[PDB]
Amino acid sequence: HHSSGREFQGHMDKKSLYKYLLLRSTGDMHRAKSPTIMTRVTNNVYLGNYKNAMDAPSSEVKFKYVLNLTMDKYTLPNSNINIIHIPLVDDTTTDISKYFDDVTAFLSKCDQRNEPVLVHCAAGVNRSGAMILAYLMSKNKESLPMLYFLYVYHSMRDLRGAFVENPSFKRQIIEKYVIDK
Amino acid sequence: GHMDKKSLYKYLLLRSTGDMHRAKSPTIMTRVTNNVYLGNYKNAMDAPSSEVKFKYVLNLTMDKYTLPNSNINIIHIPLVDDTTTDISKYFDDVTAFLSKCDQRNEPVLVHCAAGVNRSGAMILAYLMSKNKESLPMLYFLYVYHSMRDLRGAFVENPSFKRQIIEKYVIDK
Amino acid sequence: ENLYFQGHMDKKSLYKYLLLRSTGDMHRAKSPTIMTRVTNNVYLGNYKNAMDAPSSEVKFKYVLNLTMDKYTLPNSNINIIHIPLVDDTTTDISKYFDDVTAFLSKCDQRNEPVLVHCAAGVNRSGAMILAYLMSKNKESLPMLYFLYVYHSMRDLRGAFVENPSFKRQIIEKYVIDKN
Amino acid sequence: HHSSGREFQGHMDKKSLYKYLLLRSTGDMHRAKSPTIMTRVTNNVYLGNYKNAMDAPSSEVKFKYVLNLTMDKYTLPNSNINIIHIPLVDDTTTDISKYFDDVTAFLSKCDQRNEPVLVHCAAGVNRSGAMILAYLMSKNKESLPMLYFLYVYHSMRDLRGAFVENPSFKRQIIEKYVIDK
Amino acid sequence: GHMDKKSLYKYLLLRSTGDMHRAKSPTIMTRVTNNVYLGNYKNAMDAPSSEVKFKYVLNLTMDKYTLPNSNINIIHIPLVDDTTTDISKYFDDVTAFLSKCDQRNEPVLVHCAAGVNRSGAMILAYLMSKNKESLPMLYFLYVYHSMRDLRGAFVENPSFKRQIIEKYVIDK
Amino acid sequence: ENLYFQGHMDKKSLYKYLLLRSTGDMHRAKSPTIMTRVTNNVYLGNYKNAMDAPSSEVKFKYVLNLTMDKYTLPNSNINIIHIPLVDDTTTDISKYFDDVTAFLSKCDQRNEPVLVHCAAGVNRSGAMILAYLMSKNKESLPMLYFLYVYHSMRDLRGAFVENPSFKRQIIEKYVIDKN
Amino acid sequence: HHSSGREFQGHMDKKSLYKYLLLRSTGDMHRAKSPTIMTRVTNNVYLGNYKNAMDAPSSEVKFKYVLNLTMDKYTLPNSNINIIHIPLVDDTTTDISKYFDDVTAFLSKCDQRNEPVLVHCAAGVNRSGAMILAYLMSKNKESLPMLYFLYVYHSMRDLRGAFVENPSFKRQIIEKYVIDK
Amino acid sequence: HHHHSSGYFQGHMDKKSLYKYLLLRSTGDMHRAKSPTIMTRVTNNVYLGNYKNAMDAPSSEVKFKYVLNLTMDKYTLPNSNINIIHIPLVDDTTTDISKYFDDVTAFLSKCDQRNEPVLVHCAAGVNRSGAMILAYLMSKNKESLPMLYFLYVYHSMRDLRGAFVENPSFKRQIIEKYVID
Amino acid sequence: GHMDKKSLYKYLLLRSTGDMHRAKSPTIMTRVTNNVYLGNYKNAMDAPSSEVKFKYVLNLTMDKYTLPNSNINIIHIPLVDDTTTDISKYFDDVTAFLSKCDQRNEPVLVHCAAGVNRSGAMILAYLMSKNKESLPMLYFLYVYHSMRDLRGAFVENPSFKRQIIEKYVIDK
Amino acid sequence: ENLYFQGHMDKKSLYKYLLLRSTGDMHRAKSPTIMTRVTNNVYLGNYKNAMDAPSSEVKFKYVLNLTMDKYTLPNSNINIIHIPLVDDTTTDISKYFDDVTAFLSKCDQRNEPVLVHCAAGVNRSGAMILAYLMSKNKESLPMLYFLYVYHSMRDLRGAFVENPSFKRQIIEKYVIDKN
Amino acid sequence: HHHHSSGYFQGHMDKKSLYKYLLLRSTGDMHRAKSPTIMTRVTNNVYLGNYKNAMDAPSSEVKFKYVLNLTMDKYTLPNSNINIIHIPLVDDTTTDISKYFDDVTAFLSKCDQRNEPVLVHCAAGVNRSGAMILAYLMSKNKESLPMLYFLYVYHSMRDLRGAFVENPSFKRQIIEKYVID
């Protein structure tokens, strides 16, 4: 009886929610699959891949910003979209924690001002996923929000097919947003 | 289970978001409580000659067997390890039995073929039954993952986990 | 064994044996402990035998696991095949006969030792072994051979295919429909 | 949830026990099958067949006595085992009740002194079974111990495969140990 | 059931340790109570022309039928006679119905094909329901064996006996 | 009956009959009481007919019991065969067709009267009888024959294979796949 | 647990009765099938078809009356049965309500005097069914007896295979015996 | 695997599926009758319907030139061009309709050649109108043997509409005219 | 449901004695309550672009699907439409959910493939749950037939009707 | 599609594609919305596509409904075939393969457009379409063809026979047992 | 019926079972990735492992002469004879590893001839090390067609270890080098 959606939950059937989370949390998870379409995670913040960035100009959503987290700069030919390049490496040795506060603050601004922004990397899973996950966690105000983290993580992973599979990225999100804050 | 919170919560969270090792078959018996052991079919055959003086072995495979030279009492509950079989119908009787064994200090091996799914579920049910909290989600994840880390594989069968969750976490 | 001597060992001793054994003079089932070599390369055993396969003197190439539980043997270079079977009186096992006997047969052709087991090594694995033995027989209605193989094997191991549904299916497949 | 063993029961799951007994008692019993190995029924008293008697010398159990209930005397070549011959006929016309008090008293002595004794007949089912059954009943102290009789009977029959199938023997055990005492 | 104890207890004990006659198919109807009869399919067909004036026949075979010239009311509950079928789900309704028949003095034949297993179980359930003791094991064995001796065959199906035991002896 | 006259009795009366009977002008089911002789030696009846077989004028050699209940006939010298069948819309009965028709056929060859019955003598036994009748037909797509046999038989007995799943299986086996 | 019979019900298992009625009442009804034998609906009143009328002389029931509701007069050769002809048309335009009071009163008389009467039309379903249904309703005394109507209707239809399928006949019975009275 | 519409799919479709369907239909696996609601286009120009359908004919997408009224009552259609032929029939088992066949089928036949839409109706759209349509369909039969075609048409038409010449007398007359003849 | 009695009772009685139209597949969505709609699979696909602003769609087909550009939450309960499947096990959860939707004024489409059997049963269960009478037989027939007349086909599956009757009419 | 160019389009691009797609580089399942024309006359779609069939530009003669729900299309002159199938991992669908492919094949022979659908148009209908495509292949062990058809079709529709049991049955029927 | 170890069982085993397994594996019936724990003997002398495995190499039963370290960090092994070759690689989708293939496979090839045990590892033992081992295994391929061998090796290796060159860029490079080429 779980409600798969787009973007509350303190009112959906609790036994259903808990069963879902606990099953996902003990090894009952789908194999990773690449996302294809953008996901609107907030009123204004979208998560996507490289292809989604190429199609952004002709999207019904009137994007003002694109955060490019890949290593490669590109331009968008007939568009007034501002493309901001924050190049990141997708591996288990890089610190992304230093980016969190700046990126969530920016996205937060995009929502205040109702200016749609697409955050994407190449496959739309780790670099961009982590920024989006950071953003969602930043909005939470509890002291040890473990449930909320699991709920967001799994429900976002089921929706997209793959979501912050990078264990080092997940670790960093946990330290920043769940463990100590 | 009241340790260093931050480390614990970190471990659980990583474990719960997909950071799991590939299943390894256990070989040795694990002592889960004072009297209750978890093991595989070989552990069962080795029971009579073990330092531990078992009075009981609980066989969850589909096969009857005897241990002629021992004085062990064998209880047989043939269970199917698949995803459509109901095992919850046995939880109360098995946890009451295992609970009797711990009260009377009477050592008991619970086992199946590989000592992972049927026997593991019964062990998990047992540990969950000893918990008096109203919504023991952390304790469930904690027990589940620490057991899996200790043994190498533990209740890999999702249907079995679902049944435990239904009985012991989300009804309660 | 001594199936080669069917038509040929002492008939009075043999028929007294098959006939008493066939009219209700059978011993109470006893769990096996040791592997039995049924063929040049095919062995029948229980789950403990399976755990001990790596360090056995026989150089196993294959293990056929007929329990419901998957396992691995890390240190060994043994290949493990898993066919999870139910031991009850309703499941159909005959659908695996051809594939399994063909496979066991191939292990014999290539001299690649294989251990076939379930949990106790009586019913699921017993049935596959019985299927294999029967598939080697070429006669038309091999009643004598079936009775001999079943009872010898049961005397030797202590218990062998006690499941009546498994026996029925083996009879249907290998003794009653041939030519 | 019934615990099949070797040799208590006023503590095993009662509903399990009762269901088992009542099913066995209303016709749900295995066909008789010959025993093969000895059964240790007590700390010191074993039940076995002729073959078991032949192997007694080389058993890990250090037997002092063997009760031979067959019609035929035998010796055991390289052994100091005392073989006592009480020849009995296994049919429905012979009185074995006259043997009960003497045989249980002897076995009882064997247990007091920790001197293992094997009681056997040819197949290890009726003559020897009845003596063993008498012995077990003799240890019970209730006034009409019907449950205990059924429990011992069936659980011993399931263990061995066949146990006092001789209805005349059973009748005699009932009169002596259950009905009037 | 308060007779000569020693003889009774002797008979039960012999009966319970394997002294049973080979099953014979019954032919005639047995009156189990004041109004409740047990019988086979022929007894059912002969019901209308019987000295007894049945108002009801309870058909436990898998086949519908009618009795055109009679004024009997036929109730049909198709049951499977095998070892995996649940018949307990019908006990309460059937014993309540049979109980109504005895209160209103309204004769009723319960039958199946041979009048041994499905009909027999319902009769056994009925007799057990009238018993108010907490653990009626003796009464169960007594009824079971005396019925089998009277009819020649009675609830030979072990699964059916198991279900009766569970409902009426070991829960209670 | 009169299946020998299929191609040959009055067509106007026959087609009016089959056609009305086939478009919903059928009588309400009525339980049979008496045996019907369907063949030289094969009879269809209910459980009471079975109990009366020993003392019938026809010298029965066999009784085929298709109920779920075993019985014996002590005084008689009749042989009883028991195939316990379920009367529902899901069980497969087609797996027994060949064996049962072969057997009934043999009783006819050897003139050994046999009674086939279930409880009421409509569905389980009806289906086996219908299978047997159809197995005797040699034509390619014997629709006319099937309809005639079904309805005549139902008119004669009051009720005959009312189970639609049984009819379907008989159609599948004997009318639609032939040559 | 429903008791299919011949001709009470304020004592049969209520949950069984209700489940049956409600299922029949929401579209779970057998296809219509012709009746063959007469049905004794009362101590003395029978419902039948044309064939049943032809066999009435040789019936074990000693009929005094036959109500012929077909359009065709017939005689019964070697019989003292009084055949009363009330010809009716079986369609959706004919008023049968004018017949009700007279026909139930007559049948009622036949029961008082214990004189068996057979009411029949051609197929024994609509013309005769409606008269019988009227008769049964006339005996009921409640103010809005909807349950009783459904019970009689369905249980009579299941017994006979077809029973007042004519919707116009049913309508007329409803107005007279259930709606306003 | 059999296919349902109107509009031959017969000497064309899978024969096994066909025979299976017919044989099941013919040996009593038929739905209980339910009343038709919408019109059925039986042919290029010929439609089958009920009273309500007839009233709605002017408002239809179909440009009807004729409506064939088989009810007892003459009616007019307010302001519509449609020509309302009236041929009153009785829906019972005593009336000859066969005498109307040739004329009605010839008329229908004419409507199909000159492509002039026609609605054949009675009150409920089941018997009277159904019978004329069935006769029409048999009159057009030139490829397949009448017996099989009769069943095929009868059952597929009944499955489509819910009820179709349920009147056994009407079915008989059609059989005598088109199958026996 | 307190209208002109005689007309109502007449309609029910005719409806209940076999005067029913042949089933028609519905095409448009039906608003059953303030927030709860009933529909088919196309209605589901058209949900995002509908005047009604659904927050929820309850999919009772056996097929998962997504509605990418919408903000609708999809709940999937795969049900079998046959006569042996138990759907009662879902009644309480589904009616509690639908009840939540009506309390919070949150529009919800319940649908299956054709919008007749699985979705219809859930709707029927919902409407029955809002009724507080002890034996609501009239209300059951009334709702059943008026719905079927409105939609053209509604819970044609007799097993589904049986389960609703058991849950909501004859236990209660 | 472009199965005609199997042996023949650029191998480097093709094998990179099949090989990445076959070792776990597949996109997350996405529900289709539009019909896909798989053949001259055979279309694959979902339930909404079915409701829109009458007013489609393609002149459909048949619709094959594989959901559990019967429906009608009153205004249309389309013929509807209903095979209610379960979408789970235990039901057998292989028993319908021959009949359905034979039927789809016939629609192609006669140029009679047919739409095959279930609810979402992924699994039940997908499998029948996959069966049909595979039945057209004549090679001995058409692995390349199977992989190409499966992945192209899945890329084109967004999701295609995600049910692993359905895929298994298609593999068993059309790729592993041939000649 | 397919068989799992390491150590050809391919142009040898049941082909139907083989194709069935591969085809299922290839069309999405794959397990979610899980991290390897113990080493895998891929060949007579060549082993695949992770960091932890590398530290435990001195304490192993296997007498290792070489360990191939593909992590960014140089390390030493306290007092062990093993020669630690270091070739640092980045685990992402932008890095060329193909330029290392020939040298790494030639080195591995050398180790198998001179029977000198070797452990190829990276941090988690999945991508970098997996890719070199896969390349090695393709380099040795002389009997079966590369396409089928690639899949067979990929899936059986992944089933054994739990995860194996999950990096799509690394898989691509291997395909270009060993299958297309």
Tab-separated table of C-alpha atoms in Angstrom, chain F residues 4 11 13 25 49 58 74 84 86 90 104 108 110 115-116 121 127 131-132 154 160 173 176:
chain	number	residue	atom	x	y	z
F	4	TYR	CA	-25.733	-46.388	-35.734
F	11	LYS	CA	-33.114	-35.652	-40.556
F	13	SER	CA	-36.844	-34.632	-36.561
F	25	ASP	CA	-33.904	-25.698	-24.876
F	49	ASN	CA	-26.256	-48.992	-8.255
F	58	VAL	CA	-26.193	-58.769	-15.026
F	74	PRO	CA	-17.481	-58.920	0.346
F	84	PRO	CA	-10.565	-41.223	-6.860
F	86	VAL	CA	-12.500	-34.654	-7.885
F	90	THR	CA	-10.241	-27.172	-12.242
F	104	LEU	CA	-13.605	-50.385	-21.009
F	108	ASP	CA	-16.276	-55.138	-24.330
F	110	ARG	CA	-13.943	-59.999	-23.625
F	115	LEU	CA	-20.293	-50.739	-14.054
F	116	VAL	CA	-18.806	-47.284	-14.026
F	121	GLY	CA	-23.644	-41.000	-11.572
F	127	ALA	CA	-17.337	-38.110	-18.476
F	131	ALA	CA	-14.894	-40.476	-23.404
F	132	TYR	CA	-15.469	-44.132	-24.165
F	154	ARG	CA	-28.776	-36.563	-20.930
F	160	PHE	CA	-25.135	-36.218	-17.809
F	173	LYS	CA	-9.473	-34.777	-26.647
F	176	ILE	CA	-11.101	-31.112	-32.146
